[PDB]
Amino acid sequence: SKKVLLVDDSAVLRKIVSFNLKKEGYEVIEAENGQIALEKLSEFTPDLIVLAIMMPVMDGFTVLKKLQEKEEWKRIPVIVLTAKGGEEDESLALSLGARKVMRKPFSPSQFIEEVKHLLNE
Amino acid sequence: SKKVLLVDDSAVLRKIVSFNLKKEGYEVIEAENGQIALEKLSEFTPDLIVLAIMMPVMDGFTVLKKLQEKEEWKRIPVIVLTAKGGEEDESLALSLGARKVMRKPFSPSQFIEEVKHLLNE
Amino acid sequence: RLKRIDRMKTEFIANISAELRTPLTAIKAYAETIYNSLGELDLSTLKEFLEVIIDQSNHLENLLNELLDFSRLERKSLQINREKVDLCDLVESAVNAIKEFASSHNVNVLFESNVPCPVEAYIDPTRIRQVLLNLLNNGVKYSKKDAPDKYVKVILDEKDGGVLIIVEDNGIGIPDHAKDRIFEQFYRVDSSLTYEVPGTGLGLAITKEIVELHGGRIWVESEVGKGSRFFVWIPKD
Amino acid sequence: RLKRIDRMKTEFIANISAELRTPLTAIKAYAETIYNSLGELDLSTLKEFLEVIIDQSNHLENLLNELLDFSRLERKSLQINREKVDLCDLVESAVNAIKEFASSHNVNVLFESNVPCPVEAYIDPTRIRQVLLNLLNNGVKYSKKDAPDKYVKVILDEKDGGVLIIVEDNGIGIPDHAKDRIFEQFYRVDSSLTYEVPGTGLGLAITKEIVELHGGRIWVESEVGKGSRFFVWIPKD
Numbered sequence: 001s002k003k004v005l006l007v008d009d010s011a012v013l014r015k016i017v018s019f020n021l022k023k024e025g026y027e028v029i030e031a032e033n034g035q036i037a038l039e040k041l042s043e044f045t046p047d048l049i050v051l052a053i054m055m056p057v058m059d060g061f062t063v064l065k066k067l068q069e070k071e072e073w074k075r076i077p078v079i080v081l082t083a084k085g086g087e088e089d090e091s092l093a094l095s096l097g098a099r100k101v102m103r104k105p106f107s108p109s110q111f112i113e114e115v116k117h118l119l120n121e
Numbered sequence: 122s123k124k125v126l127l128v129d130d131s132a133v134l135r136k137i138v139s140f141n142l143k144k145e146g147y148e149v150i151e152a153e154n155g156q157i158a159l160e161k162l163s164e165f166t167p168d169l170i171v172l173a174i175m176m177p178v179m180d181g182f183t184v185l186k187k188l189q190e191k192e193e194w195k196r197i198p199v200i201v202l203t204a205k206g207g208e209e210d211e212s213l214a215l216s217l218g219a220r221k222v223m224r225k226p227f228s229p230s231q232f233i234e235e236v237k238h239l240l241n242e
Numbered sequence: 243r244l245k246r247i248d249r250m251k252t253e254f255i256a257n258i259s260a261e262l263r264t265p266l267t268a269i270k271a272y273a274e275t276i277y278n279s280l281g282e283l284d285l286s287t288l289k290e291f292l293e294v295i296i297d298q299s300n301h302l303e304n305l306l307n308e309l310l311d312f313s314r315l316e317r318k319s320l321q322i323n324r325e326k327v328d329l330c331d332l333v334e335s336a337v338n339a340i341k342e343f344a345s346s347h348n349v350n351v352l353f354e355s356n357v358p359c360p361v362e363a364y365i366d367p368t369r370i371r372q373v374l375l376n377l378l379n380n381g382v383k384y385s386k387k388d389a390p391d392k393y394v395k396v397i398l399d400e401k402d403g404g405v406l407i408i409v410e411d412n413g414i415g416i417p418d419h420a421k422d423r424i425f426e427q428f429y430r431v432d433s434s435l436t437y438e439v440p441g442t443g444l445g446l447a448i449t450k451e452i453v454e455l456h457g458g459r460i461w462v463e464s465e466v467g468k469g470s471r472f473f474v475w476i477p478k479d
Numbered sequence: 480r481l482k483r484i485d486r487m488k489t490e491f492i493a494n495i496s497a498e499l500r501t502p503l504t505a506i507k508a509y510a511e512t513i514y515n516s517l518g519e520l521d522l523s524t525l526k527e528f529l530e531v532i533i534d535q536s537n538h539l540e541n542l543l544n545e546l547l548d549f550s551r552l553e554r555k556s557l558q559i560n561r562e563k564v565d566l567c568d569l570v571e572s573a574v575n576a577i578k579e580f581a582s583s584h585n586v587n588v589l590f591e592s593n594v595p596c597p598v599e600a601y602i603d604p605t606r607i608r609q610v611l612l613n614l615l616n617n618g619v620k621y622s623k624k625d626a627p628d629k630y631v632k633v634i635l636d637e638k639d640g641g642v643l644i645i646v647e648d649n650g651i652g653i654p655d656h657a658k659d660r661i662f663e664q665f666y667r668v669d670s671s672l673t674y675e676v677p678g679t680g681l682g683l684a685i686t687k688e689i690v691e692l693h694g695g696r697i698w699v700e701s702e703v704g705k706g707s708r709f710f711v712w713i714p715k716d
């Protein structure tokens with residue numbers, strides 16, 4: 001199975017995204033902040049990272065930046081799933097290496113279509 | 122069966138209140154506005170009136186006032202179910218002869234408990 | 243500077259609470275009813291009640307987006323991105339988007355072009371759709387209270403080197419003292435024909451800013467008891 | 480005169496949108512998931528996902544009630560209605576109401592009375608509950624980011640002819656310039672330790688007004704990096 005690293009500070013949010021990813025047969029590893037996420041990459045290499053922006057300890061922008069600075073981390077595709085609704089927010093994330101920015105509130109079925117697209121190229 | 126006159130301008134709201142009233146075996150007659158509600162009292166005498174405040178054509182405060190002006194209409198008990206969250210809103214409705222003011226958002230199960238209380242005593 | 247009075251900000255905060263409380267009431271009532279009635283609920287009704295939750299959530303989302311867009315315009319971070327759009331599709335699309343809401347108020351929504359389609363323009367389709375929906379929404383909200391022939395009509399035309407969109411209604415109309423104030427942030431006409439209508443007074447301020455960002459202008463003509471016409475002029479290229 | 484700046488009002492509007500968008504996200508995602516997964520949900524999961532909708536709805540409702548209460552304080556319409564209340568019981572009740580929220584942030588909630596219980600007083604129990612909830616909530620919200628021993632503690636005492644309530648935390652603390660402004664409407668400390676924390680800047684303004692309405696006062700002591708103590712003094716009768 002494909003392995004997805006899910007990074008968000010909300011347990012409620014992680015639970016629903018995890019449910020929807022598991023419906024498709026994907027394995028899911030959860031992190032509650034950006035620093036935890038980068039620490040989990042020492043144990044595995046995910047096929048996809050789903051990343052929030054506004055997190056304590058280490059925010060998503062910092063995560064995306066640090067992801068670009070390691071060779072072994074830089075190629076993992078990242079979908080940013082965020083309440084940050086601005087065009088400038090999105091442009092910053094994409095310029096930091098995100099493959100796709102989806103806004104919250106989101107459609108779980110649209111989100112999973114985009115996940116599949118990134119996992120299958 | 123006890124008959125309930127349901128007065129609210131929202132069809133979505135009427136539907137969910139109607140569902141919960143019909144679960145208890147009550148009959149439900151609906152009215153979209155205050156004037157419509159008073160017109161339907163020429164056809165029947167409800168055992169309870171469930172009344173919103175903010176409605177076009179005729180608001181619930183005018184409805185409560187007009188209900189006290191006819192002896193037939195004046196003894197029908199009224200629960201006001203409203204987004205008007207002020208103490209002064211509540212005092213005004215009770216001074217106009219409402220039996221109880223319940224705020225929106227509401228609990229359907231708490232609402233039904235109060236309906237049953239009023240329908241029996 | 244004479245500016246948005248503290249009285250208007252206070253009314254605004256109250257109006258936010260009120261407009262959000264109606265969808266929230268539905269969300270909570272429908273959700274609790276499902277949770278407590280899982281034995282008395284047929285499948286068709288379960289699905290219908292879930293659809294209500296979802297659709298009320300979507301309405302609430304739109305309301306939040308209005309607040310976001312307004313803060314973004316006030317900070318000047320909202321910035322337009324144009325394309326070549328057929329206005330005829332865009333308008334039809336907006337008209338479709340508002341169908342359910344208009345029906346809920348027995349308002350017929352019409353579209354006429356004075357010019358044959360397509361009607362191409364160099365505009366941001368997202369932000370012009372949102373101008374059209376604010377005007378269409380307002381034509382439904384401020385429609386007559388009890389009348390058999392209520393309508394909102396979008397009229398498309400080409401004028402003065404640009405596209406002229408008229409949104410016309412046979413609603414309550416706007417009093418002459420209000421007409422010069424309706425585009426201001428937080429301004430709502432407070433009358434016996436508007437007391438129940440939800441809103442914040444942001445929509446036409448957003449619309450005005452989006453239109454002016456496109457180098458266009460918006461103005462109004464109205465008569466009390468008859469209806470209103472909103473004119474939006476935007477340059478062709 | 481010098482008042483509540485327009486930049487602050489803009490930030491406030493943006494903050495309303497952001498704080499409401501989080502529960503709305505959960506409502507819509509959970510509702511759509513249920514609607515699209517009825518064949519893939521066991522009963523305990525169905526019920527758990529419904530309870531999420533309901534509990535997220537309740538959080539959104541609390542956030543609307545804050546806007547409402549604030550509008551109503553700004554119009555003097557908010558009456559206080561006093562009664563004889565055991566504060567020991569009130570405080571324990573408020574501590575209970577916040578327990579789930581504090582756990583989600585790994586914050587322990589404690590209560591000590593410096594005086595034997597009951598501690599009777601002549602106060603509006605609903606309004607004081609809400610004062611206590613605002614302070615308790617802030618102790619959780621502004622708690623340290625990664626620490627094994629985070630707490631918020633309510634200390635009850637009788638002093639100077641009234642009841643003294645202290646809400647103490649070992650959170651982030653408040654810098655000295657910010658201390659004179661934290662009770663102002665719309666004021667939030669904007670720092671690298673607050674950027675992710677949702678809020679409007681209304682809670683301590685409401686709390687201060689409610690406390691003044693009881694003839695009391697509220698003040699703060701804090702040290703950046705160590706934590707904060709909020710003191711509420713209300714006359715006993």
Ligand SMILES: Nc1ncnc2c1ncn2[C@@H]1O[C@H](COP(=O)(O)OP(=O)(O)O)[C@@H](O)[C@H]1O
Nearest residue numbers: 380381384415424430431441442443444445446
């Ligand atoms: N089509 C219309 N007919 C009558 N009045 C309207 C119309 N559209 C707007 N208005 C008036 O303009 C005011 C400002 O409108 P808008 O900025 O869209 O705010 P809102 O709809 O939230 O009040 C409305 O409150 C209403 O009084």
Ligand SMILES: Nc1ncnc2c1ncn2[C@@H]1O[C@H](COP(=O)(O)OP(=O)(O)O)[C@@H](O)[C@H]1O
Nearest residue numbers: 617618621652661667668678679680681682683
């Ligand atoms: N216990 C606390 N510790 C640290 N900072 C706090 C505490 N309580 C309040 N604050 C600060 O005071 C500000 C105002 O608080 P409040 O009026 O409750 O608004 P909000 O929590 O919506 O920001 C908060 O933004 C925060 O900077």
